[PDB]
Design a protein around this ligand. Structure first.
Ligand SMILES: Nc1ncnc2c1ncn2[C@@H]1O[C@H](COP(=O)(O)OP(=O)(O)O)[C@@H](O)[C@H]1O
Ligand SMILES: Nc1ncnc2c1ncn2[C@@H]1O[C@H](COP(=O)(O)OP(=O)(O)O)[C@@H](O)[C@H]1O
Lengths: 109, 451, 47, 250, 248, 148, 50, 100, 50, 109
């Protein structure tokens, strides 16, 4: 669902940024949870309670881990992006989704 | 308030106003009601909670300032206010006057004024504020300075909004690196240009010469010590003003937090010297995100739409094999009844050593008995003579006590010449003692305290 | 001190139910009336 | 309960006498004796009871944990000069030195005497300030050892008053079974040779004096029994040389 | 590289192992001396030790083995320098982190081995308990073990070369029984007697009951303001009899 | 030390203690640099400071007397002679606290005086017990032990 | 010495009783009152005080 | 309500029974998580957590070292600003990265 | 940059200084409380900081 | 969980009884809510109301249907016991728990 897809997009951006650093390299695409919350706040808004948004983000991350795209959190509030993301956010899939979503917005009028 | 503390404090406060029955309220769980109300006010943007604590939004600050400006309000149409306005208008005019001769004349009259004040003060005719007028003159500075917090309450919000705008704009695919740096500089400068911006900038300039802010804080500390302060302000208002400088310094931190937060996503975005495929997917994602903003995220049903993304990394599990079933165990059915019986101790076990300690020599009674006995003896008395005239039931500690009294009173002790005494313990075994020559005297001994 | 805190709620109920300004702010037409009045007196020298 | 102490006398020396002078608050001469079968010490807290023990321990280790028992594990709270000065802490913010008993040019001494099978050893030491300066470098001292009871701390103080410390050096050679070391290490080596025991034993003794807090079974050995002699400085120098090695390889 | 080989990490690790073996020798000889007295009516104390199983030391042994392999395979010393660099990097990491227990395991000889104590039967030598009777110090109980072991070690260290008895018997205690009951300080002094160490106790007029028994003299100290003085006091049991044809 | 001295507020300040005469502006004593050394003096000083701070922290704002006055004190009397133990008890009482002292069966002479009850406890192998006795109910028990 | 205790127990809360059960070394049930005027606790070394 | 009553009810029924008597009775509450209870304690006794944190570390203070230790450890609430310095340095490094 | 990071650093230093002042005020408050009780028969304790 | 174990045990015994009545596989076994509720309350008691009784009963029925043991009640509140029940893994454990249940029913009354 498109919330999971938004988190997927952000994760894919972070993943490609990581892959630049050392090519494909290892599977250690590490990120801090505090980095994601600022991103989501822009789209999902600000419910005005930092803890509430943290819980929301953790719920989404749990769903994604259910889809196998992210490791569960750890003691340092870090997660590592599963490489499987590269084949779900495949530019072909991204463009198909983008066309569908452009259609959606056009209809929204 | 830490949130867990706020819930309970507000539950208690609600329990108080259950006697205000004209307002409908829940009467079966005043704790749950507290959390529900707290959430509601979170929704209204009345209170914003961060890092687990809670803080009052500017809206609630102003609303409080409203009711407090009803009957119990403070007053500003004051001779103190007029003195402030007069002095500060003089200052403003003199500053705005560009003619150097006029400034020279103004300073020539001000120097003479202050010299006359110095002459009076040196004459012993110093004058204080009428102790009663002090209450109003302090209320004046309090009310005057109370505005600054209400102003930072909005400086913070303005910079937060600027940072949020920078975020939602940086997503734009049309934006390139040169656009982003330019927008950062322009946004920050424009924010600094607005009135609240100049307020923040002046406050910052004060810090470069911290001497003045620290001097102000010290003066305020002195002021609130003077007795009249207690009449003018309660403990709360004094608590604020005493640390107004600190509360401003701390409050500006959120501004710097927003600034650094925006710089974070400038930095994370300028590094985009990518390879080919990464450059392609970056454009794809940026365009998709720019599309994303247009939707109505607040809507639940918009949110739970199903995208057409293909199923990859698919997994299959939970094959419903009937044989996989297993069933409960209850075989540990033995009941361990309660050991409610009172196992309180019986003193028979107590070892004799504990009793031996329980009969510790009472020092003070020995002091009193010695002073009494040496009163009637009225002459120097050696320790052996004390044992003879007084049986030391608990033995050694007594000799130490008597010699200690001697030493405390400055009584001479000649360790190199000796006396002796014989004694016996509680079970009859005899003992002998070697002691130094010395003499106790009642008058000198009782001349000093004891414990 | 915080003993008065119990009584402060009754004080605020009084203010809400009687004080003029507060009652004005609660009216369905509060902004229009307040704006009109503001404009009226915005030009005053005295009464 | 203490009958074995006689056999220990047949197998060891035991301290029987302590003489002090101008030490701590104990101005002027002071003395004490110890029964063969062991002794206690008593006095209201804050009266010099640990002061005496420190006075003894100054003659047995290069630099012991002065006043260890007060803190326990943590730093020593005092130094030799303070005792030689009769210090009693900063009696006032103005620091008028009234709390200091001997701020001026004075003398000081400590003496111990031990016995094994009647035969008697006698330690000693003289500390003297010839100036009001209170630096450790100005703590002129002379340790003394002797196996003859004839030598007495009273006699040493009297000789010092009679003339400079050179008189002590002369009577060292004139007196049978006497020694004086202007530095501590010679004295400590002589003591350890006489007792056929290494200095780590005396360090352990000082540990024992203020034996205090610990957490578990391992800490006993680690922090009381053993001497760490950790080689961290070896690591530092190894890394330092390897820095040049790595530079050459680069 | 060769000039740093002898002065390098391997020699340091050999030195540390030599120190550990010295510690083992000390522990063994001490444990022998505990056979000469009793911790309980029918028990004597025994000391044990094992090598610490911290994985950092295991990584160190892996590195040292690999260095041994590379020290005699000739490539102008590329592999030798690689292994030496790895080992010295770990060594520097430990040195910077000296305070933490991980580094102490490497650079601190004491931490190289963990210790334990066993209640041994004096008669059969069988084990009754293999560690302290308390996980953490149960108040005065940690006084028992600590004082017992420290007195033991001090006696052993004070014994001349090869002497079964200490040549220096006068231990000094200060605030001796600050956290010990009578039933504990009594056993402490009893142990001191077993090891044949003459004792001197300091106390703030506390536990006078026990000192009245297990000593014979006391030195009184008192402070008149900024001054103090002293006196020597003593006692002994008279020989004619405890009492006339009565209790003893 | 440097890191604390920079980014930890409290480490910028010494915490010397001093004694003030009630009826004089002099400073009778100060304790810093050398920490006094005395095993008792430190005990009394620390106990008094800690008790005062604890009372102040336990008191609702503006109240002289703490709303929660029960302070469990272990045998810090270990370094305390009787002469300063009495002062500690007096001070603790004057701050409005109520002290439940613990102590290992030693230094009970002054406890008999400056306290009105006790809890005796037993060590019975892998077991323990407790009993609440006033000093006099215990005195009679001691008398009975003396008799038979 | 003790006569200041009058104000000790007026305006504050005081610990006056501890009920215990199957805790630590104290098996079964137990209790121990505390007199409001000051109570010591005494037992053999390592006898369940701490 | 006394400890005996609590244990009696705990065993007589299940843990569910406890929270049932929480409702049924009066002047009785429970908090299956500790912090929700410690907040109630601090409120009822009108003292911040630092007071109890001082109480506990005071009950057994036997190190009793120099005064500075007493204050710096037990007395003063902990508000060191290390993480803030870290944040400041990190943001400065980020800006220097922009400049580079 | 010279503006923003300078602002952050100076603000943090001033925050540290104000924490110090708060500690000093706390010391004064405690000193007041300890004026209430006699440390010795005719003396009371007071804390001074540097 | 014990509730589900009891329910499956009672359904298993009912199914085997039905197969005795009509042979093997001749007809799918059935039972109504009317007969059900008393037998469940025999061992479980009153959860707090009849509404809660039926709620719990239907919840367990739905979970079993998820495990394939049963169908949902029809319009007349009659379920069909799926023949799959004949091939459970450890019928001995079911019989043991049934023995415990039939002991407790008499013991507690
Ligand atoms: N060298 C010193 N440094 C600091 N204070 C000292 C020193 N010497 C004596 N004092 C003071 O003089 C007394 C010394 O007695 P001491 O034996 O050290 O205390 P305690 O009886 O607890 O062992 C104490 O009151 C101490 O405060
Ligand atoms: N984790 C533990 N560590 C040490 N002792 C423990 C522990 N748990 C239980 N104990 C038991 O509880 C008792 C604690 O001893 P205690 O009397 O409270 O100390 P103190 O000697 O100061 O009075 C011990 O007798 C011991 O049997």
């Amino acid at each position: 669902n498109l919330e999971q897809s938004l988190l997927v997009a952000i994760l894919r951006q972070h993943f490609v940024a990581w892959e630049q650093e050392s090519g494909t390299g290892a599977s250690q695409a590490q990120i801090a949870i505090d980095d994601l919350l600022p991103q989501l706040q822009i789209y999902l808004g600000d419910p005005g309670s930092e803890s509430k948004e943290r819980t929301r983000l953790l719920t989404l991350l749990d769903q994604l881990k259910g889809h196998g795209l992210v490791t569960s959190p750890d003691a340092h509030e870090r997660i590592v992006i599963r490489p499987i993301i590269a084949h779900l956010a495949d530019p072909i899939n991204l463009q198909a989704l983008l066309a569908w979503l452009r259609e959606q917005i056009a209809q929204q009028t | 308030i830490p949130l867990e503390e706020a819930i309970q404090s507000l539950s208690s406060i609600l329990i108080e106003h259950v006697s205000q029955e004209q307002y409908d309220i829940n009467q079966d769980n005043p704790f749950l009601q507290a959390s529900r109300e707290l959430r509601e006010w979170i929704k209204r943007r009345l209170i914003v909670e961060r890092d687990g604590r809670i803080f009052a939004t500017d809206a609630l600050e102003v609303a409080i300032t409203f009711v407090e400006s009803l009957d119990n309000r403070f007053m500003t149409s004051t001779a103190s206010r007029l003195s402030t306005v007069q002095r500060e208008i003089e200052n403003l005019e003199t500053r705005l006057n560009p003619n150097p001769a006029n400034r020279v004349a103004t300073l020539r009259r001000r120097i003479s004024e202050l010299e006359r004040e110095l002459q009076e003060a040196e004459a012993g005719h110093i004058e204080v504020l009428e102790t009663h007028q002090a209450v109003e003159h302090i209320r004046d500075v309090y009310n005057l300075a109370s505005s600054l917090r209400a102003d930072f309450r909005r400086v913070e919000d303005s910079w937060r909004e600027a940072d949020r705008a920078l975020r939602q704009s940086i997503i734009g695919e049309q934006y390139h690196r040169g656009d982003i740096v330019e927008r950062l500089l322009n946004d920050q400068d424009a924010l600094l240009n607005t009135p609240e911006g100049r307020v923040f900038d002046s406050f910052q300039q004060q810090l470069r010469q911290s001497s003045e802010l620290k001097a102000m804080s010290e003066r305020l500390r002195v002021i609130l010590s003077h007795p009249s302060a207690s009449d003018a302000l309660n403990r709360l208002q004094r608590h604020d003003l005493r640390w107004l400088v600190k509360r401003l310094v701390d409050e500006s931190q959120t501004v710097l937090q927003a600034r650094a937060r925006s710089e974070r996503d400038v930095r994370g975005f300028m590094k985009t010297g990518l390879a080919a495929e990464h450059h392609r997917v970056g454009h794809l994602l940026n365009e998709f995100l720019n599309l994303a903003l247009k939707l109505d995220w607040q809507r639940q049903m918009i949110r739970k739409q199903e995208v057409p993304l293909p199923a990859v990394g698919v997994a299959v599990t939970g094959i419903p094999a009937i044989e996989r079933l297993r069933f409960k165990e209850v075989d540990d059915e033995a009941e361990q009844t309660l050991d409610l019986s009172n196992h309180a101790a019986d003193l028979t076990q107590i070892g004799d050593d504990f009793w031996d300690a329980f009969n510790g020599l009472d020092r003070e009674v020995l002091i009193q008995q010695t002073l009494q006995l040496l009163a009637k003896e009225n002459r120097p008395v050696g320790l052996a003579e004390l044992a003879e005239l007084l049986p030391p039931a608990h033995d050694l500690e007594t000799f130490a006590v008597w010699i200690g009294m001697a030493r405390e009173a400055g009584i001479e002790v000649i360790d190199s010449q000796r006396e002796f005494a014989e004694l016996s313990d509680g079970e009859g075994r005899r003992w002998r003692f070697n002691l130094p020559t010395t003499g106790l005297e009642s008058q000198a001994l009782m001349d000093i305290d004891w414990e | 001190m915080e003993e008065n805190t119990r009584q402060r709620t009754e004080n605020y109920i009084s203010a809400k139910n009687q004080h003029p300004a507060w009652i004005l702010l609660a009216t369905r037409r509060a902004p229009l009336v307040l704006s009109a009045l503001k404009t009226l007196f915005e030009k005053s020298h005295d009464g | 309960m203490n009958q074995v102490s006689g056999l220990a006398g047949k197998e060891s020396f035991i301290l029987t006498r302590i003489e002090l002078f101008n030490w701590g608050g104990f101005h002027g001469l002071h003395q004490a004796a110890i029964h063969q079968d062991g002794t206690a010490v008593i006095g209201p807290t804050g009266s010099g009871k640990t002061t005496l023990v420190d006075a003894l321990m100054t003659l047995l280790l290069a630099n012991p944990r002065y006043n260890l028992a007060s803190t326990g594990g943590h730093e020593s709270d005092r130094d030799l000069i303070s005792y030689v000065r009769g210090v009693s802490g900063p009696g006032d913010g103005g620091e008028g030195q009234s709390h200091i008993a001997r701020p001026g040019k004075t003398v000081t001494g400590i003496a111990a005497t031990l016995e094994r099978e009647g035969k008697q050893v006698r330690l000693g030491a003289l500390l003297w300030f010839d100036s009001t300066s209170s630096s450790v470098t100005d703590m002129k001292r002379l340790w003394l050892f002797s196996d003859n009871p004839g030598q007495t701390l009273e006699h040493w103080l009297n000789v010092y008053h009679e003339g400079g410390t050179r008189l002590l050096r002369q009577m060292e050679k004139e007196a049978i079974g006497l020694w004086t070391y202007p530095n501590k290490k010679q004295y400590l080596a002589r003591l350890r040779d006489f007792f056929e025991v290494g200095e780590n034993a005396f360090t352990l003794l000082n540990r024992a004096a203020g034996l205090k807090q610990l957490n578990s079974i391992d800490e006993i050995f680690r922090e009381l029994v053993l001497d760490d002699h950790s080689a961290f400085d070896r690591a530092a120098e190894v890394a330092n040389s390897f820095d040049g090695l790595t530079e050459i390889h680069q | 590289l060769n000039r740093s080989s002898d002065d390098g990490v391997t020699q340091l690790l050999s030195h540390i192992e030599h120190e550990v073996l010295v510690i083992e020798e000390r522990l063994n000889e001490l444990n022998e001396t505990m056979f000469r007295v009793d911790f309980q009516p029918d028990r004597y104390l025994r000391l044990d030790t094992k090598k610490v199983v911290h994985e950092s030391l295991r990584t160190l042994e892996k590195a040292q083995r690999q260095l041994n392999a590379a020290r005699f395979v000739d490539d102008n010393g590329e592999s030798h320098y690689k292994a030496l660099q790895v080992l010295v990097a770990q060594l520097r990491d430990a040195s910077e982190r000296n305070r933490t227990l991980g580094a102490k395991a490497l650079l601190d000889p004491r931490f190289r081995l963990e210790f334990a104590v066993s209640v041994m039967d004096r008669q059969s030598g069988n084990v009754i308990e293999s560690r302290t009777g308390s996980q953490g110090g149960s108040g005065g109980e940690k006084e028992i073990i600590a004082s017992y072991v420290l007195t033991a070690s001090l006696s052993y260290a004070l014994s001349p070369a090869g002497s079964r008895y200490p040549l220096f018997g006068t231990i000094i205690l200060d605030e001796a029984f600050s956290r010990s009951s009578h039933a504990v300080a009594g056993r402490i002094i009893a142990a001191l007697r077993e090891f044949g160490l003459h004792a001197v106790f300091i106390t703030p007029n506390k536990e006078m009951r026990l000192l009245r028994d297990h000593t014979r003299s006391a030195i009184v100290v008192h402070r008149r303001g900024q001054n103090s003085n002293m006196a020597s006091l003593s006692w002994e049991e008279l020989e004619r009899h405890y009492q006339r044809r009565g209790n003893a």
